[PDB]
Each structure stands twice: as structure tokens, then as C-alpha cells.
Amino acid sequence: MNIFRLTGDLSHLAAIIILLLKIWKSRSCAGISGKSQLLFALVFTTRYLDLFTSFISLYNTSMKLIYIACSYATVYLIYMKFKATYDGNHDTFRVEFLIVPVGGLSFLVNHDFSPLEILWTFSIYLESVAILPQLFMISKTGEAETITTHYLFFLGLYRALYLVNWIWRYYFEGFFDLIAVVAGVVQTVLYCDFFYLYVTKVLKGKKLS
């Protein structure tokens, strides 16, 4: 454990609470991609099956349970409670172009050919591209609300901090995971345009696009 991964985790929990409180207080999920939230719920579901086989720490167990609960609660608000404000007409990314190939690649390229390891790998590849339906909806609709841009900033910063965490762990404890690293680079690379626009427009009081 280092400050880079702790800040990465805190930034990820911040993104999840920003979005959940935005929908809850405003009673509306307008502008939010439901498809991305189904993919992030699927990530925590396939990654944290080890909760039944391993205990790392109270913090690790608590963070897993919190991520699962908040992810399922966000999907519930979009598709059931506030479904009247869900913009289905603009959240049109065909998610089967992500799930089917990512499923194929997790079976072929993994550390071990076993159900739990394959499912863990699928969560790592799926998370790389999970935000694609939300960025696609913003490009289609045009703009993005300020609170939605803050959510995207803390979510994007989280895996960027994990890359710093992996440099630290490689240097100090000789630990290295090429699957998490490569996928984490792909994950961060997809935020490049958003980050440039967030810094040049949003942080200067201007609207996105």
C-alpha cells in the first residue's frame, strides 16, 4: 500500500459518490449512460468473486462491498426508479462489440486457464472500455453538465494514479502485472481528449463542446 493507490481508490470512490448523489438529489439521470453503469457493475461482479476465496484486509473487503453496492444502486436509479429521465434514444452504443471480444480475449490471454482467473481478466479488459458508451453519448448529445465532467475527471484520474502505483510497486517490491498495466494504459489513453477539454474549458468556466 502506497499513497498513489490510496489516492487512486479515494478518487474512484469520489467519482462513484458524485454520480450517485447527483442522480439521487436531482431525481433525474439525464445525460447519463446507463450502458456504462451496467458495464461497471459487471466489472465489480466478475472481479470481486475472490471475496469468497481470499481475505487481504478489512479495507480491501469493505471497498469491494461498497463498490458493488454503489454500482448496483446506480443501475437501479437509472433503469428502475428514475427511468422516466433515462435518455435511451441517445445512449445507443452497441455494447456487444465490447462484451463479446473482451470475453474472447480473457479466455485466450490470461495468467491462468481457470474460471476465477478468466473472470478476473474479463473485468480488467472490460473496465478499459467501460466508459466508451458515456463518452459516445456526450459526443452525440453535444455538451456535458459540469457535475458529469467532475465524475469523469475523478474516474479518469483513478486508473492514472494506479499506473503510478504500479511503477512504485515494481521499483520497491518487484511486483509486476502486465495484464493490469496494458489495460490500465488503454483505460487512461481513452480519457486524453476529455482531460484536455476539462483543463482548457471546464476548469476555465466554459462548457464542454
Binding site: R5, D9, H12, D50, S54, I56, N60, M63, K64, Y67, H111, D112, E117, W120, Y162, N165, A180
Partner: peptide, 6 residues
């Protein structure tokens, strides 16, 4: 094959 991160 211990996975120690979230």
C-alpha cells in the same frame, strides 16, 4: 495468483 488491489 493473489490479487491484492481493487
Amino acid at each position: 495468483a493473489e490479487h491484492d488491489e481493487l
